[PDB]
Design an enzyme around this catalytic site. Structure first.
Site, PDB file in Angstrom:
ATOM      1  N   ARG A 237      -3.997  -9.967   4.779  1.00  0.00           N
ATOM      2  CA  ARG A 237      -4.313  -9.988   3.347  1.00  0.00           C
ATOM      3  C   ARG A 237      -3.078  -9.511   2.596  1.00  0.00           C
ATOM      4  NH1 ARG A 237      -6.316  -6.736  -0.739  1.00  0.00           N
ATOM      5  NH2 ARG A 237      -7.524  -7.876  -2.313  1.00  0.00           N
TER       6      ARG A 237
ATOM      7  N   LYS B  65       0.800  -1.204   0.000  1.00  0.00           N
ATOM      8  CA  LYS B  65       0.000   0.000   0.000  1.00  0.00           C
ATOM      9  C   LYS B  65       0.842   1.267   0.000  1.00  0.00           C
ATOM     10  CE  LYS B  65      -4.330  -1.852   0.867  1.00  0.00           C
ATOM     11  NZ  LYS B  65      -5.379  -2.094   1.831  1.00  0.00           N
TER      12      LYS B  65
HETATM   13  N1  LIG Z   1     -10.766  -6.723   3.387  1.00  0.00           N
HETATM   14  C1  LIG Z   1      -9.977  -6.053   2.564  1.00  0.00           C
HETATM   15  N2  LIG Z   1      -8.973  -5.333   3.228  1.00  0.00           N
HETATM   16  C2  LIG Z   1      -8.197  -4.631   2.457  1.00  0.00           C
HETATM   17 CL1  LIG Z   1      -7.108  -3.723   3.219  1.00  0.00          CL
HETATM   18  C3  LIG Z   1      -8.259  -4.535   1.093  1.00  0.00           C
HETATM   19  N3  LIG Z   1      -7.559  -3.849   0.112  1.00  0.00           N
HETATM   20  C4  LIG Z   1      -8.190  -4.200  -1.077  1.00  0.00           C
HETATM   21  N4  LIG Z   1      -9.241  -5.066  -0.902  1.00  0.00           N
HETATM   22  C5  LIG Z   1      -9.299  -5.293   0.476  1.00  0.00           C
HETATM   23  N5  LIG Z   1     -10.176  -6.077   1.195  1.00  0.00           N
END
Ligand SMILES: Nc1nc(Cl)c2nc[nH]c2n1
Ligand SMILES: O=C(O)c1cc2ccccc2[nH]1
Ligand SMILES: Nc1nc(Cl)c2nc[nH]c2n1
Lengths: 266, 269
Positions: free
Chosen positions: A245, A210
């Site tokens: 994730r 990110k």
């Molecule tokens: N749950 C989730 N969390 C994060 Cl940070 C994400 N970034 C992109 N899709 C995502 N889905």
């Protein structure tokens, strides 16, 4: 948790007795879609080989019509449910995609909109699959107290989901790192992550490659942010996150493995 | 916070600092067909400085059950590298040697710190470090059986700090290191890392070096040293969280990035 969270993802069990790794499988056509499906399936198989505990399959950048999102995710879910034994999550905010994906073999919904799309609460209540409720302002603003505001939002969504008939044992929450949040707001949420773990539901953290990681370390491009991302995910796990994730599955598994060995020493 | 004066180059231990590994051995490089060992080590040290190393550790003595390097060969390796790096970097430079003749020659050449795997047990090492007035790392090295590896390593380091102080080496110039991987099983290394805060109570900065070591390979199932980068970065972050102020690493940029993320998080009141 007295008893560790045990998520039944359409028959595929995800046990959160220790932090688990959710491998990112993006199915969105780019400058380089049948070839997109083939590449996403090969990538999901590689992440399973790397030790992912769950794969998150997404066909929409986080606005495409439901039929286009289905054209992308359904063939990937059908191929991965047949070729892996891993639980599979569908990254969507659309109720019709949630229903079609679960019928295709997905066992969890990962919703960036925290079931705010009209019909999403009813769909997840009917499907009886686990669901991730993420924080996102609307669909980077100033926060007086980002931790208190994210906490308040997640309490509201957990409650809305329970009142719609979604069992509290099927929920997960996620502060939504990078979604309408400055680097300072993301750092505050990560530092204060134990406060979000007090809502009685497992916390998912996604700081993978990110922009905030890039800003902290001076790394412009996503693949240059791998070291900082693995560090961020280890810090999140230490601070209570039970699901991570990530793009860099093998590297995250290695970092968590070293930490688990150390943490095991009395 | 410890302020180490490394022959005029200041190393401030107000936060964990990164010691970049510069091995000057022909086996460390694969470009020897058209490069010298010295030139390859200098280019590597310059790359580590660019990656954000706080200091460079230059050593000339890398093989399974390694053949002892004669002093003349060790000097032929480390002195030209120190001379070139002192002129081309602003970083404190450490010499990784247990030989007093190499310690003296390296400091005359520009080294500002001595990293001694033998904790000054080689005859003349105490006199050299007392004369040279540079910081020194006292490492533990005896895999043998330990009744209590943490207590044994602690006891050894207290003894070596005392030996150094009694020889006239200022306590402010001392650093200690448990010596991860030196006569220690994976279980012993994990015990020492988990109990690292106990070693930090000796009033001296602690150096931890777990970089690409066998124990990291055993914990993660990574056979090749180059496959152990993520586990090594995790181990170094855990050491820093457990009180280590210096981290001896091959993967400088990755370790700097990990510590930078951790620093941002730890800075939140
Ligand atoms: N749950 C989730 N969390 C994060 Cl940070 C994400 N970034 C992109 N899709 C995502 N889905
Ligand atoms: O690195 C070395 O020792 C080495 C490389 C090389 C290339 C061609 C011929 C002989 C050679 N020796
Ligand atoms: N001080 C020090 N520490 C460690 Cl772990 C080492 N491994 C090789 N040389 C070393 N020097």
């Amino acid at each position: 948790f007295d008893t560790s969270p045990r998520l039944d993802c359409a028959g595929r069990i995800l046990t959160l007795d220790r932090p688990r790794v959710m491998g990112i499988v993006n199915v969105t056509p780019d400058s380089f879609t049948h070839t997109t499906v083939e590449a996403a399936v090969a990538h999901g198989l590689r992440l399973a080989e790397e030790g992912a505990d769950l794969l998150d399959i997404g066909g929409e950048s986080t606005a495409v019509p439901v039929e286009e999102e289905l054209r992308r995710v359904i063939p990937v879910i059908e191929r991965l449910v047949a070729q892996t034994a891993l639980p599979l999550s569908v990254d969507t905010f659309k109720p019709e995609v949630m229903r079609a994906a679960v019928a295709a073999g997905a066992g969890m919904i990962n919703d960036v909109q925290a079931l705010r799309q009209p019909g999403a609460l009813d769909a997840v209540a009917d499907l009886r699959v686990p669901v991730v409720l993420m924080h996102m302002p609307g669909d980077a603003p100033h926060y007086d107290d980002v931790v208190a505001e994210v906490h308040r939002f997640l309490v509201e969504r957990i409650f809305a989901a329970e009142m719609a008939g979604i069992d509290k044992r099927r929920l997960l929450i996620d502060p939504g790192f990078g979604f309408g949040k400055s680097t300072a707001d993301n750092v505050q949420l990560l530092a204060h992550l134990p406060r979000l773990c007090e809502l009685g539901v497992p916390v998912l953290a996604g700081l993978s490659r990110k922009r905030s990681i890039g800003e902290l370390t001076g790394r412009e491009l996503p693949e240059q942010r791998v070291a900082g991302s693995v560090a961020a995910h280890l810090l999140a796990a230490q601070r209570g996150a039970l699901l991570l994730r990530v793009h860099d599955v093998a590297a995250t598994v290695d970092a968590l493995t070293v930490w688990q060995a150390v943490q095991a020493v009395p």
